[PDB]
Amino acid sequence: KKWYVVDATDLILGRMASTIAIHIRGKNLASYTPSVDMGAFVIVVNADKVAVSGKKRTQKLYRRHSGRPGGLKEETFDQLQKRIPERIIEHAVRGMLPKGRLGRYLFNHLKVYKGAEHPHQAQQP
Amino acid sequence: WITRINAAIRERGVYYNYSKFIHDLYKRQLLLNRKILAQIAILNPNCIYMIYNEIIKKE
RNA sequence: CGCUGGGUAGCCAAGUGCGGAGCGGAUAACUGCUGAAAGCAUCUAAGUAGUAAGCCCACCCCAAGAUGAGUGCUCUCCUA
RNA sequence: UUCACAUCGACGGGAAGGUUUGGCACCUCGAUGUCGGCUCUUCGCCACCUGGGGCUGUAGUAUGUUCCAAGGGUUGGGCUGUUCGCCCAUUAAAGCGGUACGUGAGCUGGGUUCAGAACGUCGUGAGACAGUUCGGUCCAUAUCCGGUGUGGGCGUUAGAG
């Protein structure tokens, strides 16, 4: 298991989501049981000043529907970094996690928070 | 088998592929250590550590 | 209710009263400045400033059953 | 007037979209009820009105064309079974189209391929005619999916307010 810390600032995003989704699963350790969860509990510290490398930072995509008659509520990447910057990396790794109910557990093993801090000084970062 | 080793490759040093690894033994002359014999990774990882230094010497 | 007329409480209306807003962040079309490549010139390619009832937010109802099940205050149990 | 492109634009051309007119008639004649109206809406766009702009043979007040944008809103009647359309009278304007031309396991069922009858026409006749006219029973307490609302338990882990 163990806990590791990574800084998300210069990271162009995405390229890190595919490198972090392997730690929260054990794809880097002796993962000899795809049916059982394991791996390191690596968590992001910043993830707020994360880069993007591209013009999609103001016209990416990000869409969702609440099933309501209207919905369609669409938002630009520029808005994510403005509001709830904690779901800019999460939603990214989610689509990288296998299964549906099992891979979800691997998601609860990753925190991003604002940045330059983390209430996890009791797990030996 | 490939996934078992794959999870064991992202830690050693050959971040390339396990293919080159198999290529080493192929070009070498080791008809052993098959996909099934890859169980050396989990248990007694000391034996699977030797081949790690034998694959580099060959290629 | 035999017919017919009025009427308290409550319930409704042709009753009464009020909100549909303004002010912001960020933009579409367009208008802009300065100044490149094409020592002129030109909205930028590099740096900035304006911009609708759209979008976000602002008002209202629900809302951690959003099980990533939060926060704050207070109370009860310490017989073998 | 002059001047090609404010507006419009002959002889021809290239596409998008797709609700028109057709072909196909691929899946349904051990069947999926046609149109219209009424009730109640949903979405998109090349939105008619309100707002923000460019050009204007745009002085102003009012208009023409084009671009972004629909957030919202978007009529009561005479006649007909008609959508539509015409007419009278308003509104800022009083939009189009998809949703099996929204909607009959909701109403209406007025029109129209059910049986009656009559006129004209066609055949010697029985009858027939995408000609017209009168009258002419279309059911159902629904499990589930999907909704309008409200509960029964349990999980948030010491138990509750």
Place this chain on the structure above:
RNA sequence: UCGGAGAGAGGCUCGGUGAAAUAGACAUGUCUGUGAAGAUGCGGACUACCUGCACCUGGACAGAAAGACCCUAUGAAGCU
């Protein structure tokens, strides 16, 4: 045209008696696309605690009806 209120027979709850159309099997969400080409069960993705009551009632080309429409089969039944 905007209908509202009230009085009765049902509806709702409880007690007693006590049906049906129908049905291959169920742990039978939405949407886009796809698919003998308008499926929940395909693929991707989103959303979503388990299980009732009352009500509104679009989907399951729902139910009843091997359709009275057309055509096909040198079928049948009447009529002229």
Place this chain on the structure above:
RNA sequence: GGCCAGUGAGACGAUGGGGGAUAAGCUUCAUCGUCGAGAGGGAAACAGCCCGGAUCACCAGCUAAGGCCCCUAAAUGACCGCUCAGUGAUAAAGGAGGUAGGGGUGCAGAGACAGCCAGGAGGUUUGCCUAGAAGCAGCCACCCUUGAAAGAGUGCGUAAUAGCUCACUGAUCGAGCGCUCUUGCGCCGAAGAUGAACGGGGCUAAGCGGUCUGCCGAAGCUGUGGGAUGUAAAAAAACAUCGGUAGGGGAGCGUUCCGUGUUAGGGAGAAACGCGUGCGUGAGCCGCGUUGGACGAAGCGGAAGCGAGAAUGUCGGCUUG
């Protein structure tokens, strides 16, 4: 040649032609292949497209097609170059020095081009037409003179002029500039319907183009064992065939009864249910526990009204709303 068939409204893709607009998985012919009577791997999901075409087992390897960031295994591997469009994951005529590579041409320190300053004259107010039109409605003409340069002449404008600007030339600064051709990757033109014409995330790279290596990757192939059919030699080696509908052909089990049986098994006991999950290619067989109450029947053959979960079946019983 003889016995028994089945099937005659097939569909799709590539290719070569009639029909339709060379519009359709549309229709009608020929040819090949597939589906239809063979899965699987890949195109997200699509039988007919592609690879390969399944006797079987096996925590056994190597490959084809298609791919190698994650999600489902596999190169963010190496070298060079372009795109920086997210184009690639739909879409035309046409339009624009967005842009890389190669070749060539015109002007050019008797100094070109952009910019700045100045000139841009006279007859001809031309002819014709017109109410008038004197560069500038239209028609015809479109020569000449003075010069460094200036066409009876482009666009705006006036009722007609006037006026402004342009072609051209000189001076100044002053260095190479401008316009085509061949070719690669892209932009706008593309707006329609409950959010999604990359599978999702994501991505300027895991894009694309050129070269090279390895690997993932099918009941394919190889390897080993078992079952079935067929063929000569011979110290020796075994090769090949097995998807399958309708149909044809070749082998068997079980059920009732009968002959061989009042022989033998049974009250120290059929039938109904479980189990031993051993056995056969299979339908099943054998042994046995429990329950239960009577006969049943081993082997071969013979004679059968010979085993159905659907024909809106029939009879009876029993669920669901």
Place this chain on the structure above:
RNA sequence: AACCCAGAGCUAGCUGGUUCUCCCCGAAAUGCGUUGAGGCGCAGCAGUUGACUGGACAUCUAGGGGUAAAGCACUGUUUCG
């Protein structure tokens, strides 16, 4: 133009259904006719049995028919001079 019985279990190239198991091979949905084209008969294609160096792929030798292409003297069209 009935009710009931009887021939009529009439007819029904229509439709639906059609009940154990293994092995081997393996179709077609085309032609010629048919008041015939959702029907079949004959032939082609399938299976079984009995006789035949009979065939197929490839190379070479040995001909014709004449599409594509091209041409377009001729037939039918065709602009400038």
Place this chain on the structure above:
RNA sequence: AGGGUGAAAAGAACCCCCAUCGGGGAGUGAAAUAGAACAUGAAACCGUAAGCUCUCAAGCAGUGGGAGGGGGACCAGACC
């Protein structure tokens, strides 16, 4: 539509609960876990008890891999 408890019925005195319907015992019989719904009495259907799984998880849901749990193992040997 509807067949046969057993050889002979000895087809159930009496006793207990109830409205002197019904049942359980006491007895009879080799048997009534055979008694008048009665022989052998399966399946569909309808329940109790026990072990395991079961609220953040969805699609004719089985299959292959596969942890844990309730039992049975062998004087480990990793199995049903």
